[PDB]
Ligand binder design. Structure first.
Ligand SMILES: [Mg+2]
Ligand SMILES: [Mg+2]
Ligand SMILES: [Mg+2]
Ligand SMILES: [Mg+2]
Ligand SMILES: [Mg+2]
Ligand SMILES: [Mg+2]
Ligand SMILES: [Mg+2]
Ligand SMILES: [Mg+2]
Ligand SMILES: [Mg+2]
Ligand SMILES: [Mg+2]
Ligand SMILES: [Mg+2]
Ligand SMILES: [Mg+2]
Ligand SMILES: [Mg+2]
Ligand SMILES: [Mg+2]
Lengths: 225, 128, 125, 53, 187, 147
RNA sequence: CUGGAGCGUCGGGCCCAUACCCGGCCGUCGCCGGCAGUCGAGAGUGGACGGGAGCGGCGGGGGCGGCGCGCGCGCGCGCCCGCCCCCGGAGCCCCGCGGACGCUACGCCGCGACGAGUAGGAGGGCCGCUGCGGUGAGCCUUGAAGCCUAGGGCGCGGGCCCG
RNA sequence: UACCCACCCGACCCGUCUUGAAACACGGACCAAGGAGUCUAACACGUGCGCGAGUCGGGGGCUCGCACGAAAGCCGCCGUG
RNA sequence: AGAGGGCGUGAAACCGUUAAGAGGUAAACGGGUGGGGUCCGCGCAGUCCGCCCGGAGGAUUCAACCCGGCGGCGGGUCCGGCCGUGUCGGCGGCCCGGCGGAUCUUUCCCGCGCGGGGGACCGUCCCCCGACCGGCGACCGGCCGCCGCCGGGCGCAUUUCCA
């Protein structure tokens, strides 16, 4: 009894030091595409512009699929058709931001709220800094901090998403489960832009802060993480 | 060197001052006592600037250190001897206050019972 | 039953006493004057009490019998203990536990007894 | 001024109920005033059906 | 600066019974006990009714508990009711039942027991079947109360036929400006 | 009691649950059921339809004793008489059929609601329904009149 | 105030709200919340009990892996056979044999989340006044109510408590 | 924390009617004491408790000089409604 | 008599003077400090206590053990009896068990078809004993196991007290 049990429960114990090793290993080698793709995607865009330029000839890189949108103005003196979109983008509060999947429907939702937001096609280190530093998840409908990744796996393990790095394909590459990756992900509440805006009111294009800033949103994100 | 507490935490008080009533200063017919001002125009109530502050909730006190005397022992209003033996176990977290209207002879009786069984009394040395 | 009496006696009780944000219970044998289920004397069917001995020295340990209650006179039995602090507690400990008789009070009964003892000795300088 | 679903009500207090209200704090002393008749009449007519003919 | 309506964030469900009757409060206590624990939904629902009001736990009639236990499959189960069972003077072949109720009117008591049935209470049920295994939840008709006929659109609106409240019905007591089409119109 | 009223919670509360724009003035509408045609119309017409007007025919001096006539449904005769008088019969083998004076239990008329148990009866009553007739007949047993 | 402290177009740098971030603390709502005496952390069963046998095993995917493996099954001891034994004692991070100090079972505890307000509602008021039924071996000529106090305090505060 | 005093920043007098009051609108010298949503009938919904195809309440009766009592108890009344 | 003939108490406005501090933007107010006072805690070291332990001093009887007694607790054999739940048997209370029923007999009795009474029936509630089962806080008796108190034994490397 005792020493038929003693063993029986120690097994379970070790059958775990299998398992929580195995997974730990899995994550680590997943993280290893997540280098290799993550590099190969860079070079293979340069690769090709380099290829084009050799002929008398010419890229147009893939249109961006991902554009995290920062709301930049507050919440009073706000039209309706706007305020509804801004709470479909979950940008309720002033000057938080979400990872939005560009898309004829979504792009055209941003036209209509343009004067209040600031979006751009963000870059890896942007996604990283954000998911890492300011990425809490929605678990039982709660802003809960992503400290161990038994919290990600716990919501998203049914999409082959098991760790903080597996989230981060599904957040460039869009992937199949952009939707559900970017909806345990709870809108990222970003501090005031350190060193300050240019002009909250106007299009970037005319010196302001609003709507599209291609690429240049990554200056903006450094200042607000 | 009296009856130390079980635990002496840092007591913090978000505001230490009283909550006087609007214009309790000008008029003598007004007691300092809060009466919440429901004037249409009245400046206090529309929380206006550099006016008297209004007693609101979230500007109230820490659960642990609530209700707690500077030394540590929250009062009991001990009122004869028999009521003192109630604290015999809860001696070290909170103390006896001997009621105003106990007569000098039993004001004594209670005190030396307290000291016998180590319960602080805040007015031990009072009537005499 | 116990659980029922309680609900009558929760509020509305002559040995209950609530001033000044506490509540308390002056009944004979609860240990630590609490308003409670566990630490209440009467409600229940097995009860430990600890209180000072009438002589000035020692501790009496009151144990409810449960042979036949609704029999207040005899329902409910006492014993003196004049020993030397350590054995005094070891007696209460051995009386409650290893007699499986409400091993909840267990410690409270000790803490009481211990507190009783300190109330009876050279009081002060 | 009615508001949203009741009955009509013609309570009849337009006259002067106030003056001519009888309260009944006799009721129990009356009960007894009576008792003493039932009682007395019987003891007076000794052998005779107390109730009446 | 968050831009939610705070209008009905607070939900309005009852989360203790409003009564002070120690026995309800006890068998309620008994299943805060069970309903937290055991997987069975049953005792959530029973909990959620011990809880509810008189007016909103209407009484079951015995007759209706017959035709809810006559049905195919339901033999051998316990009928369970968070409320009262009453008679049906207009029923007679009472089958042998097993019931739970908070109350059972004393005449229903004798009718059930005469048939060699059993009646349980909201504690004995908890020992019989804590998970609610082999049971049948039933309630009385909540759209029963004569009150409920007064409810709806209104009397006087088009072909929506709803009791008006009238001090005393009769010939002269609402039959005119709006019911005979001869006398103004009608609805 | 006084203690458990809103008027306690409305002190320091100036207008007193009653509005300081339009005050609580004495009798704005009128007095009682007043303005039924004019201007309180929308209640009376939408909420008490058929109030305003005559209808029907006078019966003037009228006495209910003249037209006292309670009702019973077949549904529950097998109540009126002590249930043992049914258990006796349903059995017995002679076609007894107990008699039921719906008179004696207090009803000037018997009506055909409900099932009736398969059990022959003699119902003595006053003003029978048709259906009450048919059901009793079709069960077995008879319909006797009383004055 | 004047190659300006004027006016165009522009830089850096800095200053500051009750705005955002992090933290602190006090409200409320929700969590089908946990907690009325129990194992267990992307939990991915557990247990009889038999017959047979043993170093067997379950000799499956650059999957990168998820469900099976390298802290043990069997073993150290008693000596190929037995065992693999009892918590009134394993010595305990799991303990299912009995359970907080904690469990006023309308008590307490963790999460998150949120708490501009006239009229009005609603709730909560060991907030306050006077009356009675209970109850407090309440208090009191060794001094009550009131009254008075630049006498210590407590509540967010109604007030409350103390000199 | 409170008394006086000192400084720095803030700062219009409340109440009210009012689209808008510090109002060059009105009430208001100061203080004590008194002072304004009450009772009843009738509805209605909401809820609490009893019993449940019933259930009641009187008004009557039977049981008190009441100390408590002008109470409580009980009645094919109990259903004449 | 700081109860003096409009006298218990004896507030505020208000005024009476004593002390302190201030004082050209009327006072008065909010936030923040600073100085000073009246008082209030102390300290003529506040070094705060509580375990356990080691050491060195000093002092009583024990604790560990049995044995006599007393009192609990728990266990069961339900052993024996008493108790009550569900079942069965007795048709045994049934008339020595009642009450309810418009059940039935005027085969009965009394009084005038009716009333009262008696007799038959069903539903209910009691005895006998026998059997099963919840064997239930409802005990009570023995046997047990454990605890506590009292009294005996144990004189001191023990077990207490004190510094
Ligand atoms: Mg604006
Ligand atoms: Mg008469
Ligand atoms: Mg208001
Ligand atoms: Mg007004
Ligand atoms: Mg108007
Ligand atoms: Mg608010
Ligand atoms: Mg006007
Ligand atoms: Mg002007
Ligand atoms: Mg005017
Ligand atoms: Mg005097
Ligand atoms: Mg006098
Ligand atoms: Mg005087
Ligand atoms: Mg003066
Ligand atoms: Mg001077």
């Amino acid at each position: 009894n005792f020493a038929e049990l003693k063993i029986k429960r120690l097994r379970k114990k070790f059958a775990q030091k299998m398992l929580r090793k195995a997974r730990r290993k899995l994550i680590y080698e997943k993280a290893k595409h997540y280098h290799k793709e993550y590099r190969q995607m860079y070079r293979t865009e340069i690769r090709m512009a380099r290829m084009a330029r050799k002929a008398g000839n010419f890229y147009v890189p893939a249109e961006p699929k991902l554009a995290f949108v920062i709301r930049i103005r507050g919440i009073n003196g706000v039209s309706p058709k706007v305020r509804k979109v801004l709470q479909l983008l979950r940008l309720r509060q002033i000057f938080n931001g979400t990872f939005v999947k560009l898309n004829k429907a979504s792009i055209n939702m941003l036209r209509i709220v343009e004067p209040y937001i600031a979006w751009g096609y963000p870059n890896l280190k942007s996604v990283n800094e954000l998911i890492y530093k300011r990425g809490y998840g929605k678990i039982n409908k709660k802003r809960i901090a992503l400290t161990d990744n038994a919290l990600i796996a716990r919501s998203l393990g049914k999409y082959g998403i098991i760790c903080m790095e597996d989230l981060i394909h599904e957040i460039y590459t869009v992937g199949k489960r952009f939707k559900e990756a970017n909806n345990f992900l709870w809108p990222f509440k970003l501090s005031s832009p350190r060193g300050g805006m240019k002009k909250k009111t106007t299009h970037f294009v005319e010196g302001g802060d609003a709507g599209n800033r291609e690429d240049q949103i990554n200056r903006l994100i450094r200042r607000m993480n | 060197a009296a009856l130390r507490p079980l635990v002496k935490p840092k007591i913090v008080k978000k505001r230490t001052k009283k909550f006087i009533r609007h214009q309790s200063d000008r008029y003598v017919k007004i007691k300092r006592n809060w009466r919440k001002p429901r004037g249409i125009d009245n400046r206090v109530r529309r929380r206006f600037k550099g006016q008297i502050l209004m007693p609101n909730i979230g500007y109230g006190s820490n659960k642990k250190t609530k209700h707690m005397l500077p030394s540590g022992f929250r009062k009991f209003l001990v009122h004869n001897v028999k009521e003192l033996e109630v604290l015999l176990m809860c001696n070290k977290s909170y103390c006896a206050e001997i009621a105003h209207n106990v007569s000098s002879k039993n004001r004594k009786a209670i005190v030396e019972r307290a000291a016998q069984l180590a319960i602080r009394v805040t007015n031990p040395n009072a009537r005499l | 039953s116990a659980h029922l009496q309680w609900m009558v006696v929760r509020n509305c009780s002559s040995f209950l006493i609530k001033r000044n944000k506490q509540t308390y219970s002056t009944e004979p044998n609860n240990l630590k004057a609490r308003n409670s289920f566990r630490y209440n004397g009467l409600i229940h069917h097995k009860t430990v009490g600890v209180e000072p001995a009438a002589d000035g020295k020692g501790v009496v340990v009151v144990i409810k019998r449960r042979s036949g209650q609704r029999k207040p006179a005899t329902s409910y039995v006492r014993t003196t203990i004049n020993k030397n602090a350590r054995a005094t507690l070891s007696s209460i400990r051995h009386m409650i536990r290893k007699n499986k008789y409400r091993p909840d009070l267990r410690m409270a009964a000790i803490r009481r007894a211990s507190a009783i003892l300190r109330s009876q000795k050279p009081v002060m300088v | 001024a009615p508001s949203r679903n009741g009955m009509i009500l013609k309570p009849h207090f337009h006259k002067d109920w106030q003056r001519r209200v009888a309260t009944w704090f006799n009721q129990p002393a009356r009960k007894i005033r009576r008792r003493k008749a039932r009682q007395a009449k019987a003891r007076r007519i000794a052998p005779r059906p107390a109730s009446g003919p | 600066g968050v831009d939610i309506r705070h209008n009905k964030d607070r939900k309005v469900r009852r989360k203790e019974p409003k009564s002070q009757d120690i026995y309800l409060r006890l068998l309620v206590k008994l299943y805060r006990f069970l309903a937290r624990r055991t997987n069975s939904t049953f005792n959530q629902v029973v909990l959620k009714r011990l809880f509810m009001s008189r007016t909103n736990r209407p009484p079951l009639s015995l007759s209706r508990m017959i035709r809810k236990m006559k049905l195919p499959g339901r033999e051998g189960k316990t009928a369970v009711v968070v409320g009262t069972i009453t008679d049906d003077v207009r029923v007679q072949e009472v089958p042998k039942l097993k019931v739970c109720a908070l109350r059972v009117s004393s005449r229903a008591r004798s009718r059930i027991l005469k048939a060699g049935g059993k009646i349980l209470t909201f504690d004995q049920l908890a020992l019989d079947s804590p998970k609610g295994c082999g049971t049948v939840l039933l309630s009385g008709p909540r759209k029963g109360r004569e009150v409920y006929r007064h409810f709806g659109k209104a009397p006087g609106t088009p072909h929506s036929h709803t009791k008006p409240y009238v001090r005393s019905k009769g010939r002269k007591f609402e039959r005119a400006r709006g019911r005979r089409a001869s006398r103004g119109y009608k609805n | 009691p006084s203690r458990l009223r809103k008027t306690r919670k409305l002190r320091g509360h100036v207008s007193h649950g009653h509005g300081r724009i339009g005050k609580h003035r004495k009798h704005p509408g009128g007095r009682g059921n007043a303005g039924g045609m004019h201007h309180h119309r929308i209640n009376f017409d939408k909420y008490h339809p058929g109030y305003f007007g005559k209808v029907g025919m006078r019966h003037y001096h009228l006495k209910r004793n003249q037209s006292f006539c309670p009702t019973v449904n077949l549904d529950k005769l097998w109540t009126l008489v002590s249930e043992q008088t049914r258990i006796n019969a349903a059995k017995n083998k002679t076609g007894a059929a107990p008699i039921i004076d719906v008179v004696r239990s207090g009803y000037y008329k018997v009506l055909g609601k409900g099932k009736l148990p398969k059990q022959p009866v003699i119902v003595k009553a006053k003003f029978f329904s048709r259906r009450a007739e048919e059901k009793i007949k079709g069960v077995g047993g008879a319909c006797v009149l009383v004055a």
